[PDB]
Write a protein that binds this ligand. Structure first.
Ligand code: HEM
Ligand SMILES: *[C@@H]1O[C@H](CO)[C@@H](O[C@@H]2O[C@H](CO)[C@@H](O)[C@H](O)[C@H]2NC(C)=O)[C@H](O)[C@H]1NC(C)=O
Ligand SMILES: *[C@H]1O[C@H](CO)[C@@H](O)[C@H](O)[C@@H]1O
Ligand SMILES: [Ca+2]
Ligand SMILES: [Ca+2]
Ligand SMILES: [Sm+3]
Length: 357
């Protein structure tokens, strides 16, 4: 088909996603992999994972837009703490771009946001999820204090995910920060490059922790290898769950497998997101609109590196059968601050709408 703007696309049904991408980029992402992109990418996962094979359809409809359609239910569960701002940012798009369902809007917006993160894959995007569902029940969202057994079980119950797929999806923590785990600090990143979809998170979670970016006894948090912060440039935070996954016998070799393996990490993330984005649906019933997902920013191609203040002597390795790669170390005697802002500054407040969530 040829869309009103002149773009030739695979299917006429995909045309409406072109002005939706443009509006999302102009209004909330500004083509950056920043705070508002990060919040939307987390929303794609919390919308989709709230589904349970064992409990039946009444527990939740998966990638069904339930967070937007029932903004006062799930966003208020304690495991969904902080999800409200992303829901309030996307509801105005649901109302304006009103030929696209809330469910499709959530997944597409996640794809567009990810496209702004250098090294991300260009996600598959299928369209056609209905615009009516139910509110999910509580307890379906994994939490950072959860054990690996609990987490792997949640993902298997939700959609048959394998432990490989689960760790693959956690490549999203390469572009992720925390505001609620420690109430005294904002936007504590999970790796030293939270605006770049690289493999640093897999490397850095394997370093010995030496302190905390904020206070020392928050639920779901463990010691960080790069806890130094100053002004708005908050130190790195480490989640108990990511730490546990990196060291458990079921997942340790998969975790290490992504260190310094950018294209493998990106292709694996894409395959698992392909599955996540259609939870609650038969993929044979959705039409393929992958061609209207923006082309991602390319990585620079540089290998992973130990941040200054760290080195191979700091590794806490857990995979007996695979060789840890030989990496260089960024020069410098002490930790560099991790920038609060994509252009390296500290002053970049993201667009935020008020709303019902
Ligand atoms: C065991 C599974 C996971 C757990 C327990 C987990 C936990 C968390 C926690 C606690 C935060 C911090 C929220 C805050 O306090 O502000 C967070 C942030 C984030 N997570 Fe995860 N997560 C997991 C899986 C995922 C997956 C599968 C994705 C996406 C495909 C995802 C994407 C992100 C993003 C992008 C952020 C950053 C949001 C922001 O910076 O505002 N997470 N995660
Ligand atoms: C999907 O459902 C939502 C919620 O019912 C619809 O949102 C309404 O959209 C109209 C414009 O079409 C607005 O006047 C309303 O304010 C919106 N309602 C709410 C509660 O925000 C949306 O239009 C539906 N989309 C599709 C494709 O059917
Ligand atoms: C970042 O900053 C640290 C000091 O905070 C340096 O040691 C490093 O070389 C890099 O410039
Ligand atoms: Ca949902
Ligand atoms: Ca990163
Ligand atoms: Sm946030």
């Amino acid at each position: 088909a040829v869309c009103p703007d002149g773009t030739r696309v695979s299917h006429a049904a995909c045309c409406a996603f072109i002005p939706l991408a443009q509006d999302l980029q102009e209004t909330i992402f500004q083509n950056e992999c920043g705070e508002d992109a990060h919040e939307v990418i987390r929303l794609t996962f919390h919308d989709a994972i709230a589904i349970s094979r064992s409990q039946g359809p009444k527990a939740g409809g998966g990638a069904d837009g339930s967070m937007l359609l029932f903004p006062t239910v799930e966003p208020n569960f304690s495991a969904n703490n902080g999800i409200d701002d992303s829901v309030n940012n996307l509801i105005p798009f649901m109302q304006k771009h009103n030929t696209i369902s809330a469910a499709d809007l959530v997944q597409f917006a996640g794809a567009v946001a990810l496209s702004n993160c250098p090294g991300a894959p260009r996600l598959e995007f299928l369209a056609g999820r209905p615009n009516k569902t139910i509110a999910a029940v509580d307890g379906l969202i994994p939490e950072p204090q959860d054990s690996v057994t609990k987490i792997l079980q949640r993902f298997e119950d939700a959609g048959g995910f394998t432990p490989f797929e689960v760790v693959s999806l956690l490549a999203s923590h390469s572009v992720a920060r925390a505001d609620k785990v420690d109430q005294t600090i904002d936007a504590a990143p999970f790796d030293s490059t939270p605006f770049t979809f690289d493999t640093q998170v897999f490397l850095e979670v394997l370093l010995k922790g030496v302190g905390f970016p904020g206070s020392a006894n928050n639920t779901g948090e463990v010691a960080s290898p790069l806890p130094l912060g100053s002004g708005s440039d908050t130190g790195e935070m480490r989640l108990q769950s990511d730490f546990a996954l990196a060291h458990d016998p079921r997942t340790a070799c998969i975790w290490q497998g992504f260190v310094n393996e950018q294209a493998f990490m990106a292709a694996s993330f894409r395959a698992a997101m392909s599955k996540l984005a259609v939870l609650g649906h038969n993929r044979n019933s959705l039409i393929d609109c992958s061609d209207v997902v923006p082309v991602p920013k390319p990585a620079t191609g540089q290998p992973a590196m130990f941040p200054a203040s760290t080195g191979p002597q700091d590794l806490e390795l857990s995979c007996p059968s695979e060789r840890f790669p030989t990496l260089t170390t960024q020069p410098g005697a002490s930790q560099s601050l991790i920038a609060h802002c994509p252009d390296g500054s500290m002053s970049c407040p993201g667009v935020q709408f008020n709303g019902p969530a």
